[PDB]
Design a protein around this ligand. Sequence first.
Ligand SMILES: [Cl-]
Ligand SMILES: [Cl-]
Ligand code: NA
Ligand code: NA
Lengths: 320, 320
Amino acid sequence: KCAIKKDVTELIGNTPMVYLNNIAEGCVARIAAKLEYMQACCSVKDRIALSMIEDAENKGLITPGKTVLIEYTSGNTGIGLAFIAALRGYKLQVAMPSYVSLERRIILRAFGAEVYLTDPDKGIAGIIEKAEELLAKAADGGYIFKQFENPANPNIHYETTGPEIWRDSGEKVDALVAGIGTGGTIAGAGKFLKEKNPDIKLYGVEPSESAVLNGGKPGKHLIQGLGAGIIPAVLDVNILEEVVQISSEEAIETAKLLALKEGLLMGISSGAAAAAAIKVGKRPENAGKLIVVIFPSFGERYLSSPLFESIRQEAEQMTF
Amino acid sequence: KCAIKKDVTELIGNTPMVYLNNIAEGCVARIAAKLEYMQACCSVKDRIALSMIEDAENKGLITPGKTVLIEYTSGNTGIGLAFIAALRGYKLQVAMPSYVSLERRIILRAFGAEVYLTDPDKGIAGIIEKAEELLAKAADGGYIFKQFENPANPNIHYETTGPEIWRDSGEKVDALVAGIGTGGTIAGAGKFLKEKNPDIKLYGVEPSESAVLNGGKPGKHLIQGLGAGIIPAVLDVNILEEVVQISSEEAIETAKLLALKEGLLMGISSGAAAAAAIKVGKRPENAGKLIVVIFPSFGERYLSSPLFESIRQEAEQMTF
Ligand SMILES: [Cl-]
Ligand SMILES: [Cl-]
Ligand code: NA
Ligand code: NA
């Protein structure tokens, strides 16, 4: 009884950290990775799905069996909303670009969510437009979560992710490295950490092919979860020390090294974040410091992605 | 520093339990599920991969960069060995039936393991034969782990899984329900629990189409992870109260209900174990008792399985 969780929502957050060892050869800082796949549905977005649903409930803006929940998503936020909507009795509709993997669409449908695909050429505008169309058709009321502007997104990282890093690092964390998608993680956890110790430095990560935070133009890239092509409303770029640019190729190669050297089967965005943390960790000014890097998800969620393309081809041609 | 794990092997075990709620409507016992996907590579077998490797190391039977590690597996034990072999510098070869999913073969190759497929018509005999062939070809020595007879398999569940259940249940657990594959989980955890409280009852689960523990003949079934068609050497059937028989169909339907009612995307063998626990939990003699049920893995590992067949067909036919 005494440690048994009430339901799946009590399995969100409280994720562990692990040192990076052989992959960090040459670093003069120590690097610890926070493993966001170790929770209810195996990604960081589980935190914001619960936070945004609870916020809407506290305001009476969603009611089970009445309100249609709606979100625009590339997959992980939709999945986070979907398992909680199933548990709590909400109808859920997600708008997603048609390039999202079949695997993530299967997971959404297994939780009973409805999937509406959009034209990839219309970008973020396309999925926001579809979410607005769905809201207009909701006969008994709907609610769009809007994770790029909803304060419950950074706020949950201020309330949980940041405090976990501070406590679990023994208050010794010197820097946070985090890829920026919505920017909620680095905005909320970083705000908390700098309140605890204003010397802590925050490093964003973005694709070098879509380096909008550094003033570049949007462009196509492979780092799923990063590079939305916009500066999200929930992110204040002024608190950042730097936004490190990582190529799709470098992110994929570093993800492969996480599996082969650390035994960690991680996704492309974790590869990008690790590559950035290792670069920062080689700088002489960081000698003896502790760098914490966010790993947002698990590699098993991305087996149809370019991360595994050449392996997939080999395994298809094998027999007994 | 103070809670940061040394490496991925310190992320094995110590998994949480969660109450089952709406899916257990009608039960007069309370049911708590132990979530073995919440660890390093998301299955119960991570425990025995580390235990069997450490045992061989303690005996000097495997040496990194010299010994070829070999195991016969249907996937999860191979994956557990593979991430530790990658971390520690061991070459690993696995023998598997050719029906194992492409997804699990991709994961094995991403960790650098070599995959040797066998004829499914030769059953367990086929994969043991291939492992013996590989051992004969190992020029500098090899080692076959033999999870069906290796005592390090049940012993780790005596040392970790059982103690976790006892402690996390506040010493109130009255019964353990666990599917039997190698039988290591129920043998080791059950042995520990009955030492703590000899009134605790142990319920195995097996497929009704391959009910060998109940005296039936082996047969084809869909409950991946259960129903090896043999009685493994590491299992003493005499400690069991009962082996509950669950059909492939019932296991799949219950797995679907775990996702839709509990928000838990679980695999077919977790569906079978939950179905058995819910049946036992409806018996009047168990009124007021606490039943713990083992959930061995996560449903995302099985998206190409019959559990998702009809959803997969729907999602393939969708456009923007
Ligand atoms: Cl293969
Ligand atoms: Cl779809
Ligand atoms: Na302060
Ligand atoms: Na005793």
